[PDB]
Design a protein around this nucleic acid. Structure first.
Lengths: 49, 97, 97
DNA sequence: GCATTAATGCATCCGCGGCCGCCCTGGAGAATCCCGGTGCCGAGGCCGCTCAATTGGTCGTAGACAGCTCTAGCACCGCTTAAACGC
DNA sequence: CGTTTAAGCGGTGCTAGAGCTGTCTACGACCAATTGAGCGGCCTCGGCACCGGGATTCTCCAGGGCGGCCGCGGATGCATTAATGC
């Protein structure tokens, strides 16, 4: 993931990122830095609490 | 062509890495069950606060660090880089224990 | 035919001789002028009783005996019978000094 | 039929040829330092409150000031060996 | 091993500092009244936490020219054996 995040900040190396559900709990300090346009939630009965 | 370090390099950067860190190297749950394990046969059905566990772990960690430094100097006196059991008995006995 | 002992015999009977004796091994007059010499530059024109000199000589003698025993065990750890300066620095530093 | 004798099927002996490994120099690779970049959270400021410090009075009480005494430390002189020292 | 300098010890004349005892007098223990500085509560925002970008220095990487071998086969000595002449 550090190798994925070494071409991440300054240029636009991707138009859409695929991040799992449980990885944002650990990497929430890192994914909050970059601004996003769309964030979608698949099968949203997990975040219902 | 694999890239491997010679024996003796990673220990130095581990000294540089951990000697700059003030964090605790022992986890809270095995020290918790260990403290409760020693506290089992002394007095049954005791309670421990959220504090006073990192104090025992802190004095155990720093006292064991100073014991590893005195034992390390004892192994230095033996003109070698390896720590032995007689170095721990020597540096343990010569401190008044 | 001269009669001479091998090296290592007279030290053992000196251990047997002096270890059975409780007398002081330091004379009273060089310890007197030494105590007055250290007492010269602290406070001028002092007086010393007839007591309190064999107490300093007694604690100096017994403390130096225990230091020679710990330093002797330190030289034993080096797998030799000779005492060295690094043994005195080792056994002196490892006692908390 | 038997000796012998040349042919010949192997004989060990000799001679020629192949086997590379260790110092010196070709740089390769990633760990660290430092400077931004933005989200996070507890240090301290502000307020409400509130209680032992402060001030003064009372009262009695041990500590410094002599006072006097007394007694072992100080400085010393001279036999008498005895550890310290040089080698 | 032999040779010396100096403590141990017996005895001496002192004194100056150690040591037990009255006086009173500063001077601290014990007690009311005020309050103001310090302590519980709070809620913010600028320094702190973590990591990218990039330069820098860290720390290891694999090929290149100098020696003395053993592996093996040709040989052609030896011994045999059937041809063959007696």
């Amino acid at each position: 993931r550090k190798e994925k995040r070494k071409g991440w900040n300054k240029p636009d190396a991707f138009h859409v990122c695929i991040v799992s559900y449980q990885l944002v709990v650990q990497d929430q300090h890192s994914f909050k830095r970059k601004r996003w346009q769309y964030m979608v939630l698949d099968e949203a009965h997990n975040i219902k609490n | 062509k694999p890239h491997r370090y010679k024996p003796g390099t990673v220990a130095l950067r581990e000294i540089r890495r951990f000697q700059k860190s003030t964090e605790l190297l022992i986890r809270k749950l095995p020290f918790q069950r260990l403290v409760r394990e020693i506290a089992q046969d002394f007095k049954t059905d005791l309670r421990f606060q959220s504090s006073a566990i990192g104090a025992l772990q802190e004095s155990v960690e720093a006292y064991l660090v100073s014991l590893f430094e005195d034992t390390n100097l004892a192994a230095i006196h033996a003109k070698r880089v390896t720590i032995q059991k007689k170095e721990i008995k020597l540096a343990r006995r010569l401190r008044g224990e």
